[PDB]
């Protein structure tokens, strides 16, 4: 990898629940990827062009606890398992890849950067197959090109007997397509 990553837990369980109910998060926000949670489950969200994008199957309809109360979904594209909120101030946004590379890097929930070989528009095979548990909880995590630019957000995996052989992701082009629907 030419890219590295590290994680920082900013909230605990009790404070999490609380903030979920009020919808008011005054904690300072940093970084390009946020670790995100509802009461039941947890997953990632990625920032691209000022919008925080995550998966619909983790956050469905829900708002995002923000510094001035809850934030409504700007974008909701059930068809592509994609939702988006306006990035809380402080969230450093990634920008889309323009180079067309096939040498991708998926950044996971535990801050692993793992090589992915670009296969289609929304598809890429893992160079070293991992266990599924190694990947679970990373939906809404970013796929990056070698220069650290965004090509897509992690949606799903293809696997057999608990070992992940390939990854599906929403292409960054579909995010701008969703943003092209006023």
């Amino acid at each position: 990898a030419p890219i590295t990553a590290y994680s920082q837990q900013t909230r605990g369980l009790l404070g999490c629940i609380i903030t979920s109910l009020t919808g008011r998060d005054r904690n300072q926000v940093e970084g390009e990827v946020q670790v995100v949670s509802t009461a039941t489950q947890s997953f990632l969200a990625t920032c691209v062009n000022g919008v925080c994008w995550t998966v619909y199957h983790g956050a469905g309809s829900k708002t995002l606890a923000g510094p001035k109360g809850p934030i409504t979904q700007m974008y909701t594209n059930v068809d592509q398992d994609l939702v988006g909120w306006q990035a809380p101030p402080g969230a450093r946004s990634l920008t889309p890849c323009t180079c067309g590379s096939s040498d991708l890097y998926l950044v996971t929930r535990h801050a692993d950067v793992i090589p992915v070989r670009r296969r289609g528009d929304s598809r890429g095979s893992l160079l070293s197959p991992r266990p599924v548990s190694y990947l679970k909880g990373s939906s809404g995590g970013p796929l990056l090109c070698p220069s650290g630019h965004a090509v897509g957000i992690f949606r799903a995996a293809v696997c057999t007997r608990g070992v992940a052989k390939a990854v599906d992701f929403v292409p960054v082009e579909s995010m701008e397509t969703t943003m092209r629907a006023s």
């Binding site: 999490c16 949670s37 990634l94 801050a111």
Partner: peptide, 13 residues
């Protein structure tokens, strides 16, 4: 009902 909450972050470089 409830909101999604930011319980952490991943920094890149």
């Amino acid at each position: 009902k409830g909101s999604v909450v930011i319980v952490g972050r991943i920094i890149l470089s």
